[PDB]
Write a protein that holds these residues in place. Structure first.
Motif, PDB file in Angstrom:
ATOM      1  N   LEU A   5       0.825  -1.217   0.000  1.00  0.00           N
ATOM      2  CA  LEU A   5       0.000   0.000   0.000  1.00  0.00           C
ATOM      3  C   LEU A   5       0.866   1.277   0.000  1.00  0.00           C
ATOM      4  CD1 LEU A   5      -2.678  -0.876   2.714  1.00  0.00           C
ATOM      5  CD2 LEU A   5      -2.770  -1.465   0.252  1.00  0.00           C
ATOM      6  N   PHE A   7       0.664   5.860   0.299  1.00  0.00           N
ATOM      7  CA  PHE A   7      -0.108   7.022   0.787  1.00  0.00           C
ATOM      8  C   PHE A   7       0.501   8.379   0.410  1.00  0.00           C
ATOM      9  CE2 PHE A   7      -3.263   4.599   2.901  1.00  0.00           C
ATOM     10  CZ  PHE A   7      -2.629   3.417   3.261  1.00  0.00           C
ATOM     11  N   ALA A  54       5.687   0.407   7.214  1.00  0.00           N
ATOM     12  CA  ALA A  54       4.917  -0.371   8.189  1.00  0.00           C
ATOM     13  C   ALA A  54       4.730  -1.797   7.677  1.00  0.00           C
ATOM     14  CB  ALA A  54       3.555   0.285   8.455  1.00  0.00           C
ATOM     15  N   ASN A  56       2.216  -5.115   8.681  1.00  0.00           N
ATOM     16  CA  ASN A  56       1.045  -5.494   9.478  1.00  0.00           C
ATOM     17  C   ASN A  56       0.619  -4.375  10.458  1.00  0.00           C
ATOM     18  OD1 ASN A  56       0.900  -7.897   7.976  1.00  0.00           O
ATOM     19  ND2 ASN A  56       2.373  -8.919   9.376  1.00  0.00           N
ATOM     20  N   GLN A  57       0.529  -3.163   9.904  1.00  0.00           N
ATOM     21  CA  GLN A  57       0.006  -1.982  10.606  1.00  0.00           C
ATOM     22  C   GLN A  57       0.807  -1.515  11.831  1.00  0.00           C
ATOM     23  OE1 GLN A  57      -2.461  -4.850  10.319  1.00  0.00           O
ATOM     24  NE2 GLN A  57      -2.448  -4.383   8.100  1.00  0.00           N
ATOM     25  N   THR A  58       2.105  -1.849  11.844  1.00  0.00           N
ATOM     26  CA  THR A  58       3.060  -1.344  12.837  1.00  0.00           C
ATOM     27  C   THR A  58       4.298  -0.725  12.141  1.00  0.00           C
ATOM     28  OG1 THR A  58       2.416  -3.013  14.482  1.00  0.00           O
ATOM     29  CG2 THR A  58       4.519  -1.936  14.802  1.00  0.00           C
ATOM     30  N   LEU A  59       4.785   0.424  12.624  1.00  0.00           N
ATOM     31  CA  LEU A  59       5.996   1.071  12.088  1.00  0.00           C
ATOM     32  C   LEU A  59       7.210   0.200  12.368  1.00  0.00           C
ATOM     33  CD1 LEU A  59       5.950   4.855  13.090  1.00  0.00           C
ATOM     34  CD2 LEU A  59       5.668   3.921  10.788  1.00  0.00           C
ATOM     35  N   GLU A  71       1.070  -7.462   4.998  1.00  0.00           N
ATOM     36  CA  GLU A  71       0.703  -6.172   4.377  1.00  0.00           C
ATOM     37  C   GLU A  71       1.822  -5.153   4.693  1.00  0.00           C
ATOM     38  OE1 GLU A  71      -3.476  -4.587   4.196  1.00  0.00           O
ATOM     39  OE2 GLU A  71      -2.693  -3.055   5.591  1.00  0.00           O
ATOM     40  N   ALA A  73       3.353  -1.172   3.949  1.00  0.00           N
ATOM     41  CA  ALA A  73       2.973   0.182   3.490  1.00  0.00           C
ATOM     42  C   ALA A  73       4.209   1.100   3.467  1.00  0.00           C
ATOM     43  CB  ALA A  73       1.864   0.783   4.391  1.00  0.00           C
ATOM     44  N   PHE A  75       5.200   5.304   3.004  1.00  0.00           N
ATOM     45  CA  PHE A  75       4.569   6.628   3.107  1.00  0.00           C
ATOM     46  C   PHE A  75       5.548   7.704   3.613  1.00  0.00           C
ATOM     47  CE2 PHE A  75       3.119   3.887   6.702  1.00  0.00           C
ATOM     48  CZ  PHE A  75       3.606   4.557   7.812  1.00  0.00           C
ATOM     49  N   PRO A  77       6.838  11.227   5.903  1.00  0.00           N
ATOM     50  CA  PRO A  77       6.660  11.737   7.271  1.00  0.00           C
ATOM     51  C   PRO A  77       5.233  12.240   7.506  1.00  0.00           C
ATOM     52  CG  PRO A  77       8.755  12.459   6.411  1.00  0.00           C
ATOM     53  CD  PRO A  77       8.035  11.806   5.257  1.00  0.00           C
ATOM     54  N   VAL A  78       4.696  11.930   8.683  1.00  0.00           N
ATOM     55  CA  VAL A  78       3.297  12.225   8.994  1.00  0.00           C
ATOM     56  C   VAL A  78       3.063  13.681   9.457  1.00  0.00           C
ATOM     57  CG1 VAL A  78       2.925   9.760   9.467  1.00  0.00           C
ATOM     58  CG2 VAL A  78       3.364  11.317  11.373  1.00  0.00           C
TER      59      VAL A  78
ATOM     60  N   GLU B  45      -5.909  12.950   4.837  1.00  0.00           N
ATOM     61  CA  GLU B  45      -5.739  11.584   4.291  1.00  0.00           C
ATOM     62  C   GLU B  45      -5.204  10.719   5.450  1.00  0.00           C
ATOM     63  OE1 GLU B  45      -4.000  11.102   0.262  1.00  0.00           O
ATOM     64  OE2 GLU B  45      -3.320   9.095   0.667  1.00  0.00           O
ATOM     65  N   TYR B  47      -4.399   6.218   6.830  1.00  0.00           N
ATOM     66  CA  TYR B  47      -4.273   4.757   6.621  1.00  0.00           C
ATOM     67  C   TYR B  47      -5.256   4.051   7.575  1.00  0.00           C
ATOM     68  CZ  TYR B  47      -1.499   0.221   6.437  1.00  0.00           C
ATOM     69  OH  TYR B  47      -1.025  -1.085   6.271  1.00  0.00           O
ATOM     70  N   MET B  50      -4.562   1.127  10.216  1.00  0.00           N
ATOM     71  CA  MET B  50      -3.464   1.400  11.161  1.00  0.00           C
ATOM     72  C   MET B  50      -3.674   2.566  12.142  1.00  0.00           C
ATOM     73  SD  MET B  50       0.624   1.962  10.162  1.00  0.00           S
ATOM     74  CE  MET B  50       1.831   2.358  11.466  1.00  0.00           C
ATOM     75  N   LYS B  53      -4.770   1.414  15.666  1.00  0.00           N
ATOM     76  CA  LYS B  53      -3.721   0.558  16.226  1.00  0.00           C
ATOM     77  C   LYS B  53      -2.502   1.394  16.679  1.00  0.00           C
ATOM     78  CE  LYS B  53      -0.896  -3.601  15.491  1.00  0.00           C
ATOM     79  NZ  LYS B  53      -0.365  -4.570  14.516  1.00  0.00           N
ATOM     80  N   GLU B  57      -0.974   1.712  20.482  1.00  0.00           N
ATOM     81  CA  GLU B  57       0.418   1.345  20.800  1.00  0.00           C
ATOM     82  C   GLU B  57       1.151   2.485  21.548  1.00  0.00           C
ATOM     83  OE1 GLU B  57       2.482  -1.904  18.885  1.00  0.00           O
ATOM     84  OE2 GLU B  57       1.534  -1.334  16.994  1.00  0.00           O
ATOM     85  N   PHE B 116      -1.483   9.936   9.417  1.00  0.00           N
ATOM     86  CA  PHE B 116      -2.394  10.998   8.947  1.00  0.00           C
ATOM     87  C   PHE B 116      -1.545  12.014   8.136  1.00  0.00           C
ATOM     88  CE2 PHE B 116      -6.117  10.044  11.602  1.00  0.00           C
ATOM     89  CZ  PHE B 116      -5.625   9.553  12.805  1.00  0.00           C
ATOM     90  N   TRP B 117      -2.085  12.575   7.035  1.00  0.00           N
ATOM     91  CA  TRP B 117      -1.398  13.603   6.219  1.00  0.00           C
ATOM     92  C   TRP B 117      -2.388  14.738   5.845  1.00  0.00           C
ATOM     93  CZ3 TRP B 117      -1.355   8.398   5.439  1.00  0.00           C
ATOM     94  CH2 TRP B 117      -0.171   7.729   5.769  1.00  0.00           C
TER      95      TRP B 117
END
Ligand SMILES: [Cl-]
Ligand SMILES: [Cl-]
Ligand SMILES: [Cl-]
Lengths: 81, 142
Positions: A5, A7, A54, A56-59, A71, A73, A75, A77-78, B45, B47, B50, B53, B57, B116-117
């Motif tokens: 995936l 983003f 990431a 399985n949905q962990t960094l 899975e 992903a 992307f 920097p947030v 935007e 994900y 995640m 989750k 964490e 998040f973006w």
């Protein structure tokens, strides 16, 4: 297979939201290098020093191992909060 | 020792969230943080598989660093405008020092790790908001 995936800016440059790859790569980094080698646009999107990953949905670190069914992903920097 | 985590487009109300957060007599110190959009509309935007989750964490790590009671974290998605409330963090503990420190930690990690973006709809087109080096340095101190 492994599901990949994308983003934000990464998604825009690679030109797809999601794709599948066979489970023939030992780590996230090996997968990143394979995908970057597909085209000049894919290389620009995935060779950035600040890219995040990431599994399985962990960094995770780019040295993280891969397994069939994972899975992954990629992307930038947030910017939430 | 419960935790509430919510990610969605709906608005939230601090007055509706506070009573549950502060209910227990053993939770003697209560800290909240609300962040607002800082004229152009923003779109967030994210994900989906995640975001909840990642927030869970961060709270799990906070619980291993400080003795915490009830905790609430809410983050919105969709189109938002300057002045709209985007994020809420509520934390409780027996003493103020742990409640303040855990609130700061949760926000610093949310701003560098939660997927998040923000994109801004300017007069010349959509533009991606830039990540800040100050947020990286804030997170690295923990
Ligand atoms: Cl290579
Ligand atoms: Cl802030
Ligand atoms: Cl702070």
């Amino acid at each position: 297979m492994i599901k990949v995936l994308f983003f934000a800016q990464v998604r825009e440059l690679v030109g797809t939201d999601a794709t599948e790859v066979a489970a023939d790569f030992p780590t996230v980094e090996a997968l990143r290098q394979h995908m970057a080698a597909q085209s000049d646009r894919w290389a620009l999107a995935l060779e950035d020093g600040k890219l995040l990953a990431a599994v399985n949905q962990t960094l995770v670190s780019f040295d993280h191992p891969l397994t069939d069914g994972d899975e992954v992903a990629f992307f930038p920097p947030v910017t939430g909060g | 020792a419960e935790t509430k985590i919510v990610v969605g487009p709906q608005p939230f109300s601090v007055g509706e969230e506070y009573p549950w957060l502060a209910e227990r007599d053993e939770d003697g110190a209560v800290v909240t943080f609300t962040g607002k959009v800082r004229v152009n509309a923003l779109t967030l935007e994210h994900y989906p598989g995640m975001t909840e989750k990642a927030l869970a964490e961060i709270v799990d790590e906070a619980r291993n660093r400080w003795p915490l009671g009830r905790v609430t974290v809410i983050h919105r998605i969709g189109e938002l405008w300057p002045g709209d409330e985007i994020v809420f963090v509520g934390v409780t503990s027996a003493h103020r020092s742990s409640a303040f420190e855990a609130g700061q930690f949760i926000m610093d990690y949310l701003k560098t790790r939660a997927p998040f973006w923000k994109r801004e709809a300017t007069p010349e087109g959509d533009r991606w908001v830039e990540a800040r080096e100050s947020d990286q340095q804030a997170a690295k101190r923990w």
